[PDB]
Design a protein around this nucleic acid. Structure first.
Ligand SMILES: [Zn+2]
Ligand SMILES: [Zn+2]
Ligand SMILES: [Zn+2]
Ligand SMILES: [Zn+2]
Lengths: 72, 78
DNA sequence: TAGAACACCCTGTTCT
DNA sequence: AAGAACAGGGTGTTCT
């Protein structure tokens, strides 16, 4: 019942991982564009939780990958 | 000189009392009008706020606006 | 479940 | 200088 990426409430397995809906669509958008232009403003370790996941796409997106998320 | 004191992009004038670029000018007005907006840093409250990163952390960008002295009444303060 | 799309929000520029 | 508002993007939900 918990997103592996942002620890929000998960809506099932998306792209191989238990994630919420916001993290599902975020991951899709990133891998298809787009992630090449992401740059963390901290230290590549931002907190990704429900309230702060919007802040750093670079860390969000790295969390996605590390959690296993994958297209096929 | 000619650089924004909040983000270091090219400053365009002295806005709300401080040399800043246009994007920080309207960021700051939008932050202090209405609110609470609210902004939280996902880092350690010391994010790098520059042209390429200032969108990532409105919390640190707003703190840098305040720390530089921005204030609405800077005009009517003569 | 994967993807479309809408509504809403944030940003930075123009303002004929 | 200050402020409105347009255009462009991002987010997250609903819908299919
Ligand atoms: Zn999530
Ligand atoms: Zn980060
Ligand atoms: Zn600036
Ligand atoms: Zn920050």
């Amino acid at each position: 019942h918990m997103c592996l990426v942002c620890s929000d409430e998960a809506s099932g397995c998306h792209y191989g991982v238990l994630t919420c809906g916001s993290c599902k669509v975020f991951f899709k958008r990133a891998v298809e564009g787009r992630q090449h232009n992401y740059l963390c403003a901290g230290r590549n370790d931002c907190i990704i939780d429900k309230i702060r996941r919007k802040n750093c796409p670079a860390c969000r997106y790295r969390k996605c990958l590390q959690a296993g998320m994958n297209l096929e």
